[PDB]
Ligand binder design. Structure first.
Ligand SMILES: [Cl-]
Ligand SMILES: [Cl-]
Ligand SMILES: [Cl-]
Ligand SMILES: [Cl-]
Ligand SMILES: [Mn+2]
Ligand SMILES: [Mn+2]
Ligand SMILES: [Mn+2]
Ligand SMILES: [Mn+2]
Lengths: 440, 440, 440, 440
């Protein structure tokens, strides 16, 4: 499953449908990024630019021109064919092949953008530009507008209105096509296989980074070369650090390990967290915390559907957490009073759900306190956790326990579809999986 | 093998020894780098900052103050301890632990750098600063100097002299300590194991990226989490593209695959290229080109020693290449005339050797045409190649063949030590290795 | 005659009337400008900021908020009262006195603009901002919008639409109120008195700058402290340089002097050019060129009215010029063919008319080739000239003659009113004025 | 009196004498400065650039190259000859005429600076650059150095050392040549004539700006077109504001007027303050304050000589002031205790003396608290004042009195020479001058 030229074209058209007549939208590629000295990081295209192109080169700009309500066309600026640069650094699409390959009407050399962009904007009423997204892009846009403003003697005129297209595009991205959902389903499966593998490989004495290695190898073998974010492998007290990515410690017999990892597959992210015993067996204390987090996730998965909200479901989770913590003596008092005091916050300090798509923590408006009403096509994580610090004023057996369990779901007409349920999370199933692996 | 606190301190002292009395050297950490939206790439410390600290955090500045020829001290600016930021994003060294951990005299909060830096520079004659290395660093330095220049009424004075420390530091980095060489030896071994693994795993029908996966997994298992540069897996015609990193193609029965990959181990790079048949057996045409490249490497490895140069050894390689290409009918004419015409350049278009250390294409002055006389402690690659384009005007059987073979060496008192010879390169040894693997 | 608080308020209201509901307009003051080291040039307020305020301080921002179609209000950011800064550098309006003095609803300290501006823009749909007018302003606006864009968790929202208010404001400025015209009339009178004075003072052997001195003194005595542009005193060959401002030469018996000078009176510009003989008597050659330029001006003054255009009147001037130049042997051939060839351009190379107001070369759309139809309330210069270079291929007696004659007019219901006719321009009147002065 | 080509050359040579062998000094012209829209302020050359050139154009750079201790040469970058630009905006020196006119060895087009500057710096050890003086200059220098740093394959090398030449040049400027002193003497005379004129013209009912007009006209007539700083005409309570430049008030019968004004003559500044009664007669209260300020100035003029300091002389002035204020009941207590408490500071809040030259508040090191030992050739102001605020807690008759009296002096072998004593300052002489003028 991937995204086709025809879909990128439909997206461009859907944006054009929302634009004023006499306007142009400018969408810029990500710059290349230095790792050290003359070496660059592996290229990651800007998500919005990707969304409208599927084109994985820097020094590229998509220009959508809406002349009026019937006439529109597209111009791509992109790197020219150059034998020498290509022998050295790789093949370039170039101008001749781009229109057919990408489905754009015209292609021009990026090297000519300053000579050409102002000509495309001349006489328009509106320019759609994500101001402040990239410095290099702002420079190009501001220079073109300045030429037009200052060019009255050459009969040039600048569009006086600049609109940030990010709100409109981010609303588009918030609602996935069936094809996007198919890609996300595969990302979920790949990510799940990686997590299963980490559970099956984990042994006391291995380093946290060894599990990262197993995960990244599994991503790669299914064609997801890169993770969607830096893999977290937090064992023991490291599990209480939310974005722990050092992954430098030896994993101890008797500790839990929390793994938060996701692949990037054809542009789309998986995002799974599983927490499990390093030695294959939850202690009683570990199991007691684990059960609360799992009940939180399982209830959330029953509830998520069109017409509810992240906020509403979060309320249910908070009650489950407070109730469970009171039962274990971690919190003390009346459950309703404790809920009213947000007494769970020292142990569950983050949100339950984030949008998912081309990015983790994907784009799109949440509403105040994530109160936006859910509709079919929205894709989100469900990630309850409890983190009991090593020095927390709680019964000693719970100190240093960090547990999160996270699935990715898509809202459907009738509820939700869980994209990541093919990696186990019930404690007895985790133990059985690890017992079986440990016998080999 | 790694680098100790005591060694980082010796390096700081060696720099101070070269500084004028009444001076300060300012060494800035790398900024964090966005991958997409709110996700950052895995952090890579600035190599020069690393060289003097072994400290892997952003928002840090090392200040070496040489008050006079006997008195000097060090101040580190680094991120403060912060419970919340650390629960979220990871542990920070902070100010209390830094002096003992890093061996610096004093540590201050990075948040205070603008309030404190000018006070450290006040009254000095010279500031050593790598101007233009980082924008954020230039802003900090320029602001401090401006405060001093403008502060005569507060009895402040700016150092009038600014010296770029990069030439001095890069000369330091060019000559490796025994401890650095030990780390580089391990990087070489790890990188070699990865290349051996790629040869043993390669089969027709696998994707180029599968070999990348095997390599990165092997790096990781030995504790080299990250590659030192983006892995190149160029099969068939892709092998003729020097920095081919797409790695997207299905590897064909009958093609060669060129793999250029290296790990980063405790800050130090491996850098190995091996080229081998996807199906385990060189064709005659492939073998004929391979032999020339191998003879080039083997001769280079015999020759490299103190008192010669990259330029001198390159001359020997050029003769081997021209002679071999004439013998195969790829070049036509008199060898000496062809050498005089640089007739090899269409097929061997890059340098034979690059410095190696904390970076691939490491720092240090090469001399005109890489004519600098080699001395013990220098570390370099040896990377002859021949690339015959698909459309080259040569006997048809050679078209689309890209071969490079690269080892990493250290110049010793008596010659050189090859750090990467534990992965095979003789064609009969490559074939035997692959035959053995293919029987499993 | 000046502009009152009530008029500045009417202007603000007229802008608000044109704004979308749920919007804010941001109008920034000019920065102070260094002349040398710690000395600044005399402050000149930004014309658009002045137009809406009559407020002559830097570090000030006018914010017009249109909450909806009935509710709107104004906020001024301006420098705080500060005893010490004021003892040193002058009085400041401050926040307490500003609402009554300027007629704005609220005033806040400029020092608080970054803490307050985003709060004013939060939740609005549209921001009107002259992007690129001033760097310091762009920084403030971009920072506020970035806070809002990034502030969804604090329930902040940025206006997605940014509109350049310059086209709307410049159209406002193009049409003068009766009060503006009264100020411009006085500027014209003051400027005329200065030019009369220069003619009455001019003698052979005086320096060009002496006439500048007389002019500036005359401006000052009527309360126009500053010129509206750098005074031009171009005698002999210097008269052939359009913006000659060196004014460094000794004025020679037998040469013409061209004086282009205008005052700034209560914000509004005069702009007059007169050319006259240094010795009080036109030579025959000088008179022959002068007559053509004068006929051009006199015809233009008869013609300018509502419903014609600068382009149309320019056509009449071009015919007068070509006809006259043919008559003198400066041009050769058929007048209509020469007109068709724009054969006048070597001698008359600039436009006939420019808008006049708060600036010379005032704001407002001219139309292609200055073809915009004139309407009552427009104010413009009328400035024909002929410049015969010292090396021009023309009868020798004309070489080195530069003549321009310029009046300022306002278009009225029935024609135009000449604001600068109180300084003579008929050659016999110039001679009589100078003869009378030279007898004293 | 002016400065000759030969002197500019001696200055360049004196700088070169202080430079390291294998170095270049870069001195940049001031940018042109916008007043409003398309109109620029009258051009003021950068004082340091002027000091080495006497060249009054923007877009110019002086490059002094010291190849070694015997060989050096100069290159000027400056605007090219261009017929059209010159017809419009004025004559340009160009490249052909510059070497002879300015005494530089070579001249190149400013438009070529980026193509040429790096070539001039290539291989040098040291670049002298005033970093942060101008943004446009920093851009040019940083770009050239970056080309060199990055150009090792083209055998380019950047100078690693950058030295701010401002301290050395400012020390040069601090000591005036006899020719500079002659120019300063003329500036003093011109400025004095202007102040005499203001006293002779002043009448009750005139505006403060009228006196500015008289002053500027007097500057102009002697060939000092521009003031060296914005003229201050502070009558009544406005005299208590140190840099009062509004000059907007009607001068009242019974008030004092303080005039601080100076011309710029051939690059060099005058700087005179006189305070006098608007109606020609000091009141008793006015005279009582005036006498203290005058005694302060007269004592300072007796004392200033080589081997004393501004600090030492200031001590004498403070005692005179405290003693006088105690005598009038403005201060109360023991003089020595009051001196120890700096009890004069509410009434005399600024320094006694500032360096004078190409700038007011001229360049050069003062020492802590202006303690530097004076030597022949130094030029400075002497400017005691007393300012009694309208609301000061003092005998009512003194409130709202602002008096400053300022002369310009040059330190000589035997004492000082007063450059501005040709405008009167003894109260009886002021009254006699004004009485005589008021009878006309
Ligand atoms: Cl291109
Ligand atoms: Cl910090
Ligand atoms: Cl303020
Ligand atoms: Cl030029
Ligand atoms: Mn996650
Ligand atoms: Mn390599
Ligand atoms: Mn004019
Ligand atoms: Mn003064």
């Amino acid at each position: 499953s991937e995204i086709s030229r025809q879909e990128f074209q439909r997206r461009r058209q859907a944006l054009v449908e929302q634009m004023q007549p006499g306007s142009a939208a400018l969408i810029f590629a990500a710059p290349e990024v230095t790792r050290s000295a003359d070496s660059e990081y592996p290229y990651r295209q800007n998500s919005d630019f990707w969304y409208f192109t599927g084109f994985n080169e820097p020094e590229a700009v998509l220009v959508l021109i809406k002349s009026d309500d019937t006439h529109n066309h597209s111009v791509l600026f992109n790197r020219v064919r150059d034998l020498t640069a290509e022998i050295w650094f790789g093949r370039r699409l170039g101008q001749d092949a781009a229109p057919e390959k990408l489905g754009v009407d015209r292609a021009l050399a990026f090297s000519e953008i300053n000579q050409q962009l102002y000509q495309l904007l001349n006489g328009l009423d509106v320019v759609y530009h994500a101001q402040g997204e990239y410095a290099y892009a702002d420079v190009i846009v501001n220079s073109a507008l300045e030429k037009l403003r200052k060019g009255s003697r050459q009969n040039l005129t600048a569009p006086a209105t600049m609109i940030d297209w990010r709100p409109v595009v981010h609303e588009m991205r918030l609602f996935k096509s069936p094809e996007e959902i198919a890609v996300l389903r595969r990302a979920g499966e790949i990510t799940a296989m990686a997590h299963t593998r980490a559970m099956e490989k984990c042994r006391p004495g291995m380093f946290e980074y060894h599990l990262e290695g197993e995960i990244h190898h599994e991503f790669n073998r299914h064609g997801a070369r890169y993770p969607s974010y830096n893999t977290i492998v937090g064992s023991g007290e490291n599990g209480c650090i939310l974005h722990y990515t050092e992954n430098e410690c030896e994993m101890r017999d008797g500790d839990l390990v929390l793994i938060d990892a996701g692949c990037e597959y054809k542009g789309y992210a998986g995002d799974i967290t599983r927490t499990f015993p390093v030695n294959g067996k939850f202690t009683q204390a570990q199991r007691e915390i684990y059960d609360i987090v799992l009940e939180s996730l399982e209830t959330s998965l029953r509830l998520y559907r069109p017409g509810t909200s992240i906020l509403e479901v979060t309320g249910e989770v908070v009650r489950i957490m407070v109730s469970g913590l009171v039962k274990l003596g971690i919190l003390k008092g009346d459950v309703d009073e404790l809920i009213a005091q947000n007494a769970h916050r020292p142990f569950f300090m983050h949100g339950l759900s984030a949008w998912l798509g081309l990015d983790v923590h994907d784009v799109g408006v949440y509403g105040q306190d994530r109160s936006r009403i859910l509709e079919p096509g929205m894709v989100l994580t469900v990630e309850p956790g409890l983190y009991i610090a090593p020095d927390a004023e709680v019964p000693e057996q719970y100190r240093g326990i960090g547990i999160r369990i996270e699935d990715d779901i898509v809202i459907t007409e009738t509820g939700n579809e869980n994209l990541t349920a093919s990696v186990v999370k019930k404690p007895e199933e985790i133990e059985a999986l690890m017992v079986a692996a440990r016998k080999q």
